[PDB]
Enzyme design. Structure first.
Site, PDB file in Angstrom:
ATOM      1  N   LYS A   1       0.746  -1.236   0.084  1.00 41.13           N
ATOM      2  CA  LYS A   1      -0.100   0.074  -0.072  1.00 41.13           C
ATOM      3  C   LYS A   1       0.983   1.303  -0.101  1.00 41.13           C
ATOM      4  CE  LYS A   1      -4.092   1.949   2.629  1.00 41.13           C
ATOM      5  NZ  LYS A   1      -5.115   1.481   3.914  1.00 41.13           N
TER       6      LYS A   1
ATOM      7  N   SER B   1      -9.566   1.331   2.911  1.00 42.76           N
ATOM      8  CA  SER B   1      -8.922   2.109   1.997  1.00 42.76           C
ATOM      9  C   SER B   1      -7.704   1.426   1.231  1.00 42.76           C
ATOM     10  CB  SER B   1      -8.080   3.258   2.927  1.00 42.76           C
ATOM     11  OG  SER B   1      -7.285   2.690   3.944  1.00 42.76           O
TER      12      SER B   1
ATOM     13  N   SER C   1      -9.953  -1.195   7.168  1.00 42.75           N
ATOM     14  CA  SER C   1      -9.447  -1.724   5.770  1.00 42.75           C
ATOM     15  C   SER C   1      -8.593  -2.664   5.683  1.00 42.75           C
ATOM     16  CB  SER C   1      -8.672  -0.501   5.343  1.00 42.75           C
ATOM     17  OG  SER C   1      -7.903  -0.954   4.160  1.00 42.75           O
TER      18      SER C   1
END
Lengths: 461, 459
Positions: free
Chosen positions: B71, B145, B169
């Protein structure tokens, strides 16, 4: 009559009555010449009536049978007003605070509400509309605070023990200035239900007593989970070693006394005497504890106080002691961002403190770096107060237990106390260490350096 | 090649890491969701790293040659890091701690995946790079997210990925893409070299093909890191396996915001569980529900303002418009508001603890529903908030969680559930989640593919 748990138990045993105990307490109260000790006293005749009723009941199951005590006026006692030393705040609680309810069920008797720094905001004792209670050794000197009257009342032999609250350090500072044992339980152990909030998340009910053992018994009785209090925690016991004990002390260059050389000398002297206890002194880095301390009033936690009295403050700020008013008004400019930043700083400081905790079992500090004349404080009311929090103010922020014990007297006749600081839930083990230290350094309590009641605490274990 | 830890170990046991990477890149090139990646390494450089590793011993490298995605709020040396905000972009000099540990175990970073900006959202739509999509239906949100991280694994592009979990998330995009999401107790994995969202709550989180694989990755990444003020030393709290009590909300607390297919599949999960060795206990979900509301409905949103405040004051137009308005609103919160929220949380904690006395672990829908990207575009705050219904209390109440596949509704969309347990119950939870996953929907990713071995066993 000795006004201690032991003294009273003994007096009752040898033919004395609770009614006589109360009579004597009232006689002492009437003769004591400090006009600032009490905010609200019960009428003697109603206390005598309660004394008689109790006299006529069994002592069985009442470990505090007939024992008079004073309660700080931010703690609810049914039948008396409660004001936090702010007349405009005054209310009439319908019920005893939980800790009061438990102590009374053990047979103890409330005499009245003692004076305090307003809204428990101060370590001096001078921030009260009712006047400044004084050091029991010299009327020119601060009693310390915010639990000012509670400490004075016990040290002057008016009652056998008292309750206060400790947030910044009030379980400890006025114990030192009045030659008492101050037991500061791990936060959450004793319910704060029925107690006016100061820093709600940090506030502890605290005990002033003639000995560690008596203070400890009072603490255990008052202790107990209370779901009405969001911060209540069920007891755990974390044990500390006795054989092989390591006692942390700050580095030489970290021993701050703000010019008070007599205090510096007595701290060193305590260390000198300690080689004859079964303990090893270890110099530790006191910096993270010192910097955590500063967050209490120098960081966003002061906003907790604004939360507690904000309605009264916006309604009429002139109803407030001017120094406390100014402190809490300034908190209004702190944002949620400021609050989280303080938390981040605390978390980091906690990491660093944990590294120091790996080196010691318990920490030994001056209770306060100095002591001040009332007049000096009135002239310099913010700065001189802040000095008194130098060693105390990190304790609840870092989730620690503490006990303040007498450590001696400087030559001008003023007391000097020290405080032991241990990790959360180490209260029982600390009690043992503190008792030993107390009996080694300055084995007496209160204004006469009176003989400590038995028992001495012994290894369980 | 099966792109799992087991699949890769098997392939190597005459295949090469170089071939593994080649295949991963081939898949990446073909995939067809333009929003998955923010920054991809050049194939040629990954190939060189692959070759160097190939010539190394596999000894001491439990993730020998395994490709993963990270990420883009997590630092990886040699790539930029932006938290999906171009104006925020910087070039970290060092791998985040968790990245350093994984690479040292032999894993290889392929690139940085897209996310909701500043990890603020559960939808996957709040990115200037576009909205990655549910791997089962392009019209549907991937969730967020950690949007790209979940897609990349479910699509077989990489064998696992790292995201972060604050609101939920680690769990939501696992549900929406048929993956295992392991959400470690907070503090276990270092957040050093991770951009803060709610600093005091943020968790590094793992997306994997199985509980066992996700668990191995978690353990490798786990470790005390004094650079991180919120880092905690590992503890292990055991949960029972014989005598297990699984709490579920009361019937009247099972909220699906009209999604009756999801409601049916939750009940179905409960129906299948009678043949696991566990007792279901209805609990009062209210204190968990009300604690969840404090995250964005209370003062914790101010933590995000703390994290990006400078950039926001410098140039608020540099922000995704939804994230911007959320964080701008936090500006009105005082320290007093922050303490009241904590008081409320402390009380709600008391009530939750009373519920915890009734169960060992809590079993929830991962999310109450799933949304079309276009639906969210039109209604971007409200529809997002719905997705936090079951997730948002977890880090506030100091819990561990694992999201596992629980099946599919008739229209072809996945439905996931989440197990919630007390702090440090991570290992015991893994065993329970593995069992549940293999009972309910024993496959992962876009193909409902065969779960790699091993199955977890009691110890």
């Amino acid at each position: 009559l000795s006004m201690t748990l032991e003294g009273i138990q003994a007096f009752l045993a040898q033919g004395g009555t609770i009614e006589q105990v109360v009579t004597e307490a009232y006689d002492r109260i009437t003769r004591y010449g400090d006009k600032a000790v009490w905010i609200a006293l019960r009428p003697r005749e109603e206390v005598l009536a309660e004394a008689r009723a109790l006299d006529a009941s069994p002592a069985t199951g009442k470990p505090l049978y007939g024992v008079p005590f004073a309660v700080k006026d931010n703690i609810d006692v049914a039948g008396l007003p409660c004001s936090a030393a702010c007349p405009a705040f005054t209310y009439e609680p319908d019920r005893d605070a939980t800790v009061v309810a438990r102590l009374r069920a053990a047979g103890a008797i409330v005499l009245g509400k003692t004076n305090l720094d307003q809204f428990a905001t101060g370590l001096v004792g001078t921030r009260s509309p009712f006047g400044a209670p004084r050091c029991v050794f010299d009327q020119d000197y601060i009693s310390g605070g915010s639990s000012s009257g509670s400490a004075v009342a016990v040290a002057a032999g008016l009652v056998a023990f008292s309750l206060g609250t400790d947030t910044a350090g009030s379980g400890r500072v006025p114990a030192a200035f009045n030659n008492l044992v101050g037991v500061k339980p791990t936060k959450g152990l004793l319910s704060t239900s029925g107690v006016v909030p100061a820093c709600r998340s940090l506030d502890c009910v605290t005990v002033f007593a003639a000995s560690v053992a008596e203070g400890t018994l009072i603490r255990r009785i008052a202790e107990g989970y209370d779901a009405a209090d969001p911060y209540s925690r069920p007891s755990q016991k974390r044990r500390l070693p006795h054989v092989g004990l390591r006692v942390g002390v700050p580095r030489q260059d970290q021993r701050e006394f703000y010019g008070n050389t007599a205090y510096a000398a007595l701290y060193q002297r305590a260390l000198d005497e300690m080689i004859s206890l079964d303990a090893e002194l270890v110099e530790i880095d006191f910096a993270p504890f010192r910097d955590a301390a500063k967050l209490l009033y120098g960081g966003p936690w002061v906003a907790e106080r604004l939360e507690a009295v904000g309605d009264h403050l916006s309604r009429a700020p002139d109803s407030f002691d001017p120094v406390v008013r100014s402190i809490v008004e300034t908190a209004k400019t702190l944002s949620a961002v400021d609050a989280f930043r303080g938390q981040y700083e605390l978390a980091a400081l906690t990491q660093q403190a944990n590294a120091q905790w790996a080196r010691m079992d318990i920490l030994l500090l001056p209770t306060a770096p100095t002591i001040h004349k009332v007049e000096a404080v009135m002239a310099d009311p913010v700065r001189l107060n802040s000095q008194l929090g130098h060693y105390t103010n990190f304790v609840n922020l870092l989730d620690c237990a503490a006990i303040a014990v007498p450590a001696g007297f400087i030559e001008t006749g003023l007391p000097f106390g020290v405080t032991l600081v241990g990790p959360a839930f180490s209260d029982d083990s600390m009690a043992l260490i503190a008792d030993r230290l107390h009996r080694r350094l300055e084995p007496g309590y209160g204004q006469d350096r009176a003989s400590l009641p038995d028992p001495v605490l012994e290894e369980t274990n």
